[PDB]
Amino acid sequence: GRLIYTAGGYFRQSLSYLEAYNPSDGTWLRLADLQVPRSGLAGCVVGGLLYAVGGRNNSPDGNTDSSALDCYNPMTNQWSPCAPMSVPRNRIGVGVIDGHIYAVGGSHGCIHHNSVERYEPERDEWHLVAPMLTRRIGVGVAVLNRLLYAVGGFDGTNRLNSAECYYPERNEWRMITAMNTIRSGAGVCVLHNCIYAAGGYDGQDQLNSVERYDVETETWTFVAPMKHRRSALGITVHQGRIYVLGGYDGHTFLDSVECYDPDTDTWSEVTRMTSGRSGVGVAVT
């Protein structure tokens, strides 16, 4: 009975919600608010704990990019602060390898980072690792075969179809085949040994298209598109299906949650969030 957690987000201002969806019975839990509102963050899980990484607090009274790392324990319904990153990272990407959290890219003001740093929960410390070949904000991250992939984003000048691969044992990055479509703000995840990139913004339109990367054929292939165009959607995988949550469709902040079934190559609407929002962090535990 693992749950889909969605933390933070944006609607008129950065949000503090933590809510958890149960796909088996369709219920939503309202859990402890974040201590500081944040949008453009990422979520991940290590050791059954949920982590909220990076983002920004955009409020009527100011706009502050976040270096914060905060840890939610489902057993206690409590957020605890952790050591902060070396730099604020709004529109960050995150992946986990061997129980370590990798924070990639994101922005601080107009600085678009290529830097990458790694968090060790047992010692509550961050350390920089090799930087990406490309500056990327609004970047999607996938972990596959104990390699970390950074997909798409915005380099400060252009939205990107490029993607690159981090080798943790070697501490180095290499460019891989570029996507079919330029995507900033896509949801990026791993399902059945392929990397999926769904939605995003190509510099003109919000996208409903979805493409997936086969690391051996080194080819991106379109699959069925989502029912809603969305950028800055949340994304996760639960019991062999992709879930996308919220995002902005060009006009409204969506509450729609769609579900992709790889066996039938179809998307379905499965639930709604309790309010529309974009820029959430999402993880499963």
Give the footprint of ligand GX8 on this chain (CB under 6 A): 10, 39-40, 56, 90-91, 138, 154, 184-185, 200-201, 206, 231-232, 248, 278-279
Shortest gap between Cβ of 251 and ligand GX8 (angstroms)?
9
Taking CB under 5 A as the rule, which mask of x and - marks residues 101-140 in contact with Na ion? -------x--xx-------xxx-------x----------
Dist. CA 142–CA 284, nearest whole Å: 15
Q: Which is nearer to ligand GX8, 240 or 250 (CB)?
A: 250
Tell whether residue 66 is a contact of Na ion (CB under 5 A). no
> Considering beta carbons, is residue 15 or 189 the nearer one to Na ion?
15
**Which of ligand GX8, Na ion, none does 8 bind, CB closer than 5 to 8 A by kind?**
none
Other beta carbons within 10 Å of 155:
19
Q: Is 59 in the site for Na ion (CB under 5 A)?
A: yes
Closest Cα partner for 96 from 118, 80, 69, 70?
A: 118
| Neighbour tally for 80: CB within 10 Å | 12
Q: Which is nearer to ligand GX8, 6 or 46 (CB)?
A: 6
Number of residues binding to Na ion, judged by CB under 5 A: 14
Answer yes or no: are the C-beta atoms of 31 and 16 closer than 8 Å: no
Reduced 3-state DSSP string for 133-200:
CCCCECCEEEEECCEEEEECCECCCCECCCEEEEECCCCEEEECCCCCCCCECCEEEEECCEEEEECC
Smallest gap from Cβ 243 to ligand GX8, in A, equals 18
Task: Give exposure, 57-69, as e/b (b: 16+ Cβ within 10 Å).
Answer: bbeeeeebbbbbb
Q: How far apart are CA 118 and CA 168, in angstroms?
A: 10
- What token pair was written down for 213? 């990367």
Q: Any bridge partners for residue 31, and if so which?
A: 18
Q: Which does 16 bind (CB under 5 to 8 A by kind): Na ion, ligand GX8, none?
A: Na ion
109 binds, among Na ion, ligand GX8, none (CB under 5 to 8 A by kind): none
Q: Which is nearer to ligand GX8, 23 or 200 (CB)?
A: 200
- Tell me how far, at minimum, the Cβ of 181 lies from ligand GX8, in Å: 13
38 binds Na ion (CB under 5 A): no
| Beta-carbon contacts of residue 23 (< 8 Å; ≥ 6 apart) | 4, 238, 239, 243, 259, 270
> Using CB under 5 A, which of the segments 9-17, 78-86, 199-207, 257-265 binds Na ion?
9-17
Chain residues binding Na ion by CB under 5 A are 15-16, 57, 59, 62, 64, 108, 111-112, 120-122, 130, 156
